[PDB]
């Protein structure tokens, strides 16, 4: 509880200089992010598609670039955000695949977020060590939504924070 709508937290906080102390720390937080919050959540595909289109379209971020195949990479990202890819078609996340992966999640304060990311995928002189897949992010406010696309973008790779 306690709604405060100061998004991403990052709200000023006080420790005060009020006694053996002349100053102290006033701080705003940072360090308060999304990837964690949302839990995986699920859907019927036809309805899904219909829905996918239907949803708050308004955010997307791109996937392109990493350190891994989207097998290990995808798993890693998935676990990191604690979120769902709804369903496979065996077409094949292996030989290429030339697979677009649909992901859904529902959070602790209940937003459902929808993705279709469509991605190249690693494999010798076939394709995938980048993507150039587009991550399409729908979350109700664009501001969190895009931000989520980012957040995930942060999540995507593994490097010096």
């Amino acid at each position: 509880s306690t709604e405060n709508g100061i998004i991403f937290g990052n709200i000023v906080y006080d420790v005060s200089g009020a006694a053996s102390d002349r100053n102290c720390v006033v701080l705003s937080d940072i360090h308060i992010d999304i990837m964690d919050y949302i839990q995986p959540a699920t859907c019927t595909d036809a309805e899904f598609r219909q829905m996918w289109a239907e949803f708050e379209w308004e955010n997307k971020v791109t996937v392109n670039t990493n350190m891994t195949d989207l097998n290990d990479y995808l798993q890693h990202i998935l676990k990191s955000t604690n979120m769902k890819c709804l369903t496979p078609e065996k077409a094949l996340s292996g030989y290429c695949g030339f697979m677009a992966a649909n992901l859904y999640a529902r959070s602790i304060f209940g937003e459902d977020a929808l993705a279709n990311v469509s991605i190249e995928k690693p494999v010798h002189q076939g394709p995938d060590a980048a993507v150039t897949g587009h991550i399409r992010i729908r979350a109700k406010s664009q501001g969190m939504a895009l931000s989520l696309g980012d957040k995930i973008n942060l999540s995507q790779k593994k490097t010096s924070l």
Partner: protein, 281 residues
């Protein structure tokens, strides 16, 4: 390098920057007093001190507190931090421009925009000082070099510099040689705001918007109710010191010294801030 935050609003007569904090406390004549402890781009509080206008802002001198003045005519000191009112007296027939805090017996000075300013004992109850020598409507009231020596700027077209006492105003002296306040080539006029020859300096320049002091010094840097903002040094007292500070188009509401910077910053009304030296000027 960066102008971190910027929205044009507020119609601002009185102003102060936190010598300790990156606060700006701002007085509008919207009737508003505001403290924003400017750092986190956030206002702590905002009280429109009364229905009438607000001209004054001054420091208590401590760390984070305001002493405030409105057309209420009241000296309030309220601590933002402690969100409470320290000791209270209202004001005469005009608002409070400057304040200083002292403490033999935790003791107090209040500087005012009207008539008198009175300095009060709430401990071993006696009189430290009485200041008469103001009339109405003080634009910029000031502590001097000696902090508890002072200057005031008026819409009564005078300037007052006063001498105080621990039992009201007086000074004892007998050694000097000539004076720069008044004693050799050039010098600017007395005004009338009080009635003792300390120096009441002429605040006529259609009236004086601001007065600013030179710490050990008596040079003043001024805002004036003339295009002419006229600069005088009473640590010299030049001729072509009958300087009118000139825009292109009208005014020079103020022009000011920056403690550190040996410079003058001018600001005016053709849509402008005008840039001035004062190191070689």
């Amino acid at each position: 390098m960066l102008t971190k935050f910027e929205t044009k609003s507020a119609r601002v007569k009185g102003l102060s920057f936190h010598p300790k904090r990156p606060w700006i406390l701002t007085s509008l004549h919207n009737g508003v007093i505001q403290l924003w402890d400017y750092r986190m781009c956030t206002l702590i509080d905002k009280f429109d001190e009364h229905d009438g206008p607000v001209r004054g802002i001054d420091f208590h001198k401590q760390q984070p507190l305001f002493v405030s003045g409105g057309d209420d005519y009241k000296i309030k000191v309220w601590n933002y931090k402690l969100r409470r009112c320290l000791f209270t007296l209202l004001g005469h027939l005009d608002y409070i421009r400057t304040t200083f805090f002292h403490h033999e017996y935790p003791w107090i000075l209040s500087a005012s925009d009207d008539q008198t300013i009175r300095v009060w004992n709430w401990q071993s109850r006696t009189c430290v000082c009485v200041l008469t020598g103001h009339n109405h409507y003080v634009m910029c009231a000031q502590f001097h070099p000696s902090e508890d020596l002072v200057v005031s700027a008026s819409l009564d077209q005078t300037v007052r510099v006063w001498d105080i006492s621990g039992l009201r105003k007086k000074n004892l002296s007998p050694g000097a040689v000539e004076s720069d306040v008044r004693g050799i080539t050039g010098v600017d006029l007395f005004g009338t705001t009080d009635a003792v020859v300390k120096h009441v300096l002429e605040g006529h320049d259609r009236g004086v918007n601001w007065a600013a002091f030179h710490p050990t010094m008596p040079l003043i840097v001024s805002g004036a109710d003339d295009r002419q903002v006229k600069i005088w040094r009473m640590n010299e007292s030049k001729a072509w010191e009958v300087d009118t500070c000139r825009g292109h188009y009208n005014n020079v509401s103020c022009a000011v010294f920056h403690p550190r910077q040996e410079l003058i910053l001018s600001n005016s009304e053709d849509k402008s801030i005008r840039v001035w030296d004062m190191s070689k000027r």
